[PDB]
Amino acid sequence: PLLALREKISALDEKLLALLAERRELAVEVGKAKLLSHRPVRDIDRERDLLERLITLGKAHHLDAHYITRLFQLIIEDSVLTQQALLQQHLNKIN
Template identity: 90%
Template sequence: MTEENPLLALRDKISALDEKLLALLAERRGLAVEVGKAKLASHRPVRDIDRERDLLERLMTIGKRHNLDAHYITRLFQLIIEDSVLTSKPCCSSI
């Protein structure tokens, strides 16, 4: 057995997790569109800074339990939140 086989097996596991992450991000994006529609119907702004702050705080707490760096969690979810906001805007402006 070569040293490559365990490495390939680990890479395969990472690739499988990456696919799951992408599927979850796509599902989240779909929900962001629905949130945008709900906000439009209730005449609320697309961006909710208080909600974003609370979400990041909660996610950092959860991340800490999993030994994930707070800066990493913040950067990652700021990108995800920004995508959600941008995804919601076309829905809200076109309906």
């Protein structure tokens, strides 16, 4: 009976993976937009808000706040570094 469920889990994980790829593509686009707008990569205000929104909505699914924070902390960290990778490249090229 375990094999049936594990097969569902593996399918779900593949969907998570796809979304994670998509969010990473979005962070690159966002980084591009920051170069034009002359804004820095990191934006603490936005992260503060985003997390509060996620913790509020997570509550409805019974996902706890600390689980959501530990998880989005990795996701945001990754998207921040991805953008910083493009900034550094950019900075070496124009300079």
